[PDB]
Amino acid sequence: ETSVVIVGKISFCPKDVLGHGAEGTIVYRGMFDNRDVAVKRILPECFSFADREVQLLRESDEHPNVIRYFCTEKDRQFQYIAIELCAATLQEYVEQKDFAHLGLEPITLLQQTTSGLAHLHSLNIVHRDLKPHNILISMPNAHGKIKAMISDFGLCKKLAVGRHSFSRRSGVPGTEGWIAPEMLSEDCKENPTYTVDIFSAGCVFYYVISEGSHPFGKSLQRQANILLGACSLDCLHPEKHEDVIARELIEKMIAMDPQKRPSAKHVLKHPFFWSLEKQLQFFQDVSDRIEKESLDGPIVKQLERGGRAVVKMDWRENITVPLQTDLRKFRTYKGGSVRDLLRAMRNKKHHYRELPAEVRETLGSLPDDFVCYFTSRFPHLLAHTYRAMELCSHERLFQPYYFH
Amino acid sequence: ETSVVIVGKISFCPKDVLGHGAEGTIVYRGMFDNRDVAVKRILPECFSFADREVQLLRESDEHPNVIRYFCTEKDRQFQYIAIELCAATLQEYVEQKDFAHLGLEPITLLQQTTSGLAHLHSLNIVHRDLKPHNILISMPNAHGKIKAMISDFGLCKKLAVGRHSFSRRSGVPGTEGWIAPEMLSEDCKENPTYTVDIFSAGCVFYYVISEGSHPFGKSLQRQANILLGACSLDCLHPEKHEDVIARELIEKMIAMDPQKRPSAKHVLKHPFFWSLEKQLQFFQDVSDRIEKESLDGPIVKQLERGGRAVVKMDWRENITVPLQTDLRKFRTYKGGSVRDLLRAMRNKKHHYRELPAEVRETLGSLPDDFVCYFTSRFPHLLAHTYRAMELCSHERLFQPYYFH
Numbered sequence: 001e002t003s004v005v006i007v008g009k010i011s012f013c014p015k016d017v018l019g020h021g022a023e024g025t026i027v028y029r030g031m032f033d034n035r036d037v038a039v040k041r042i043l044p045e046c047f048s049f050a051d052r053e054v055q056l057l058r059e060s061d062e063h064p065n066v067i068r069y070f071c072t073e074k075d076r077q078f079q080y081i082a083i084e085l086c087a088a089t090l091q092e093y094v095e096q097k098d099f100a101h102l103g104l105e106p107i108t109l110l111q112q113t114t115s116g117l118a119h120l121h122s123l124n125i126v127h128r129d130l131k132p133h134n135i136l137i138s139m140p141n142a143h144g145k146i147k148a149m150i151s152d153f154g155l156c157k158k159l160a161v162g163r164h165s166f167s168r169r170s171g172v173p174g175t176e177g178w179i180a181p182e183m184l185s186e187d188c189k190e191n192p193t194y195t196v197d198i199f200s201a202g203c204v205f206y207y208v209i210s211e212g213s214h215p216f217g218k219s220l221q222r223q224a225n226i227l228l229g230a231c232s233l234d235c236l237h238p239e240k241h242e243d244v245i246a247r248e249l250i251e252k253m254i255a256m257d258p259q260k261r262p263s264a265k266h267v268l269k270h271p272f273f274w275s276l277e278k279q280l281q282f283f284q285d286v287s288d289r290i291e292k293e294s295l296d297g298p299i300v301k302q303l304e305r306g307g308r309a310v311v312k313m314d315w316r317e318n319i320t321v322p323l324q325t326d327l328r329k330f331r332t333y334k335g336g337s338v339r340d341l342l343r344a345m346r347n348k349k350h351h352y353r354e355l356p357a358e359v360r361e362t363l364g365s366l367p368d369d370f371v372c373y374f375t376s377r378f379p380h381l382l383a384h385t386y387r388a389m390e391l392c393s394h395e396r397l398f399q400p401y402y403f404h
Numbered sequence: 405e406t407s408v409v410i411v412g413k414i415s416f417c418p419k420d421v422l423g424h425g426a427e428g429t430i431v432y433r434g435m436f437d438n439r440d441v442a443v444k445r446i447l448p449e450c451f452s453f454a455d456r457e458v459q460l461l462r463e464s465d466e467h468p469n470v471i472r473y474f475c476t477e478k479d480r481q482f483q484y485i486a487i488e489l490c491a492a493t494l495q496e497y498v499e500q501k502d503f504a505h506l507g508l509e510p511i512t513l514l515q516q517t518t519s520g521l522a523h524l525h526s527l528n529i530v531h532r533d534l535k536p537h538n539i540l541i542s543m544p545n546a547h548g549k550i551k552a553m554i555s556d557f558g559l560c561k562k563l564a565v566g567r568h569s570f571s572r573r574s575g576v577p578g579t580e581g582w583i584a585p586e587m588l589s590e591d592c593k594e595n596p597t598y599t600v601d602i603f604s605a606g607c608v609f610y611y612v613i614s615e616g617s618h619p620f621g622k623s624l625q626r627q628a629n630i631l632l633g634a635c636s637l638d639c640l641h642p643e644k645h646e647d648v649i650a651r652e653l654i655e656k657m658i659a660m661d662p663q664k665r666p667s668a669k670h671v672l673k674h675p676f677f678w679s680l681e682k683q684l685q686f687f688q689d690v691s692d693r694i695e696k697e698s699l700d701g702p703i704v705k706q707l708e709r710g711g712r713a714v715v716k717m718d719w720r721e722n723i724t725v726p727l728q729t730d731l732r733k734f735r736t737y738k739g740g741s742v743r744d745l746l747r748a749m750r751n752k753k754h755h756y757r758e759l760p761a762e763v764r765e766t767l768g769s770l771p772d773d774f775v776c777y778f779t780s781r782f783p784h785l786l787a788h789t790y791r792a793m794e795l796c797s798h799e800r801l802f803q804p805y806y807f808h
């Protein structure tokens with residue numbers, strides 16, 4: 001005994017409220033062409049912007065991590081925008097989940113969000129209101145997989161061709177606690193640009209992997225801390241390898257200097273998104289790259305700068321006893337050298353199949369267990385090597401690992 | 405002074421005809437929700453077919469290489485189906501002289517098509533009408549890039565739950581030339597299955613890379629030769645590396661025994677689609693795997709079976725003089741051995757940075773010219789090594805290269 005509203009090909013039940021937007025807009029569950037949709041109702045004072053918004057998303061190239069638009073209808077009083085129906089917000093995903101049964105789904109979710117953002121930016125569109133509440137989680141497809149989608153383009157700006165920045169004349173679009181600091185600065189000479197989205201995404205990254213925390217604290221003091229640069233990444237412990245890599249990326253995404261934030265396409269290349277196999281492949285390509293480099297050369301000096309803390313003074317003392325026994329039968333590696341620890345890894349990896357069964361047992365299978373054997377014992381190895389080998393980042397061998 | 409037809413939210417100008425077909429079929433250029441679309445008009449004698457097939461298109465169309473459906477309108481006389489407006493068919497792409505590829509070359513097109521096909525089969529949808537006329541080429545996107553899309557879903561069937569097969573009662577295309585033989589024979593025990601699409605795809609593959617030829621002849625003799633098993637791949641040359649690899653894949657796709665045809669996901673794993681760098685990596689992983697292998701073990705024995713033709717009696721005599729001069733130090737490399745050829749390749753890849761400038765100059769840069777140096781001189785090496793190392797296809801290191 002429920003009621004239906006039909007405006008053209010868009011139908012919805014007024015009792016199925018999914019949320020409330022800005023300016024007294026309501027979102028309903030509904031139907032369009034017998035597809036499940038979400039239906040946003042807007043006011044007459046919004047008809048000009050909605051047509052501009054719809055024209056933006058109807059005309060832009062489709063992308064799997066940008067929400068799919070279906071149809072707009074107008075009646076005597078309202079406009080209605082139908083889009084793909086989603087199961088949840090990213091906010092509800094983080095509140096209502098336990099990241100043990102998910103595995104790499106949180107990181108895949110952030111990589112999809114970042115792909116969507118890189119797609120917007122390459123169309124010269126700055127979102128300016130990225131936040132967990134308007135990153136949407138799809139309904140499971142026929143195979144049960146889900147994905148993240150960027151939505152809510154009311155605050156976005158399409159830069160003119162040739163422009164790389166926009167002026168603050170419109171003021172401060174955004175939501176308190178996710179606004180880049182250069183947006184709220186009286187004495188900032190440089191116009192904001194695409195990197196306002198990187199700062200917001202950085203906060204989202206930390207929000208997801210911390211399962212609810214914000215780099216700049218609780219919501220009431222959140223935006224004040226941003227202006228002061230008062231951030232804190234406590235949930236990332238500095239001696240767990242996964243947390244070190246995540247901290248290296250996020251710190252740059254939320255950096256106070258906008259020009260120090262990586263573009264969205266840079267973010268996607270970071271080791272935060274590397275599989276175990278690719279990390280070991282990076283260690284191998286590095287070890288091969290520096291095998292004939294002199295100890296006085298710029299590449300090795302960079303790699304050894306701070307190296308004793310990376311290898312924990314003597315890495316041969318921080319490995320398992322069967323691998324210590326096996327390393328002594330051969331030429332001696334220098335225990336304080338990052339380069340030699342990489343050389344030992346490359347050598348045990350290349351000769352894995354002929355290693356004594358005791359040594360293959362403590363290393364574990366190639367490549368997953370093998371690489372974690374080293375990264376879990378030397379949690380700064382990959383981050384430190386990644387930063388040091390930035391010198392070779394324009395060479396063909398290191399193209400899969402960096403971005404130009 | 406041109407006339408406009410409006411049927412619901414679909415409109416079109418009947419002067420803008422795009423094609424004709426059976427059952428009084430006409431396709432027009434038109435509009436829907438202010439997008440350019442193609443509009444197909446069908447008769448009352450198709451209302452029954454049409455709705456079932458529109459639903460299957462609506463369940464498949466989220467994949468980027470499946471045509472996107474937009475709207476369907478029922479008319480007091482006809483039915484009208486609006487889909488994404490496209491620029492060309494695959495047929496026009498192959499047969500038109502200076503067809504701008506727009507950053508889309510034949511291999512990427514075939515891989516896009518197979519990706520779409522694999523998406524369908526994973527939804528338990530068999531297409532059953534795959535041919536160049538109903539693979540479409542998109543309009544360029546905002547970045548100027550184009551892609552291929554499967555369409556013409558009028559004959560596609562969703563298999564019943566638990567069936568891997570369908571019966572020949574209701575869904576064989578009226579236009580022949582591209583139909584798997586078991587769809588049209590009578591002496592047939594097994595019922596047709598997904599591999600009817602692979603057979604058609606096999607013919608399309610040849611049609612694209614041969615630039616217009618069919619494996620089974622021209623027009624009317626095609627389907628007759630298909631039922632006969634009389635095919636010919638003579639555009640694929642036996643002494644060109646790309647053609648040898650292409651022939652090894654197309655041959656299994658159009659195989660008479662439907663059970664011997666690889667699935668669409670298996671096709672995608674075939675070296676036909678490997679980048680140059682992946683091919684060089686396969687050679688290195690093989691060479692490492694057999695370095696300590698017994699000369700009389702099954703693996704090396706398998707690798708040397710027919711090795712003389714692969715290395716052309718003496719591979720040391722079929723390489724450039726600078727590389728010959730550089731291999732002189734390695735007197736352990738036997739020129740009659742496929743394994744030793746692989747060992748020399750791996751050794752010069754590993755030590756590439758240290759090689760003299762003469763040697764690097766004839767090899768070319770790593771990894772593209774380097775791997776082509778050898779495959780262009782030993783056009784059977786990859787195909788032979790690939791088949792030979794199938795003995796190691798269940799080992800973790802050779803997971804990426806095979807299909808399990």
Ligand SMILES: N[C@H]1CC[C@H](Nc2ncnc3c(C(=O)Nc4c(Cl)ccc(NS(=O)(=O)c5cc(F)ccc5F)c4F)csc23)CC1
Pocket residue numbers: 018019021027038039040053054055057058067068069081082083084085086087088089092136151152153154
């Ligand atoms: N508890 C859960 C919570 C999640 C619920 N599922 C949802 N599924 C899908 N959408 C939503 C929403 C929601 O606001 N949609 C929405 C809608 Cl309908 C229209 C416009 C915009 N913005 S736009 O920029 O104008 C815009 C214009 C375009 F032409 C295309 C895309 C656009 F974005 C928008 F963002 C709120 S919830 C929810 C299910 C119940």
Ligand SMILES: N[C@H]1CC[C@H](Nc2ncnc3c(C(=O)Nc4c(Cl)ccc(NS(=O)(=O)c5cc(F)ccc5F)c4F)csc23)CC1
Pocket residue numbers: 422423431442443444446450453454455457458461485486487488489490491492493538540555556557558559
């Ligand atoms: N020289 C160039 C040539 C390419 C032209 N561009 C095109 N762009 C986009 N579509 C086309 C087409 C074209 O047939 N569309 C089309 C359309 Cl509109 C609707 C349906 C189907 N499928 S179906 O099997 O009929 C079919 C039947 C059912 F009952 C149910 C579902 C179905 F799916 C289809 F396939 C023909 S040309 C062209 C531009 C000029």
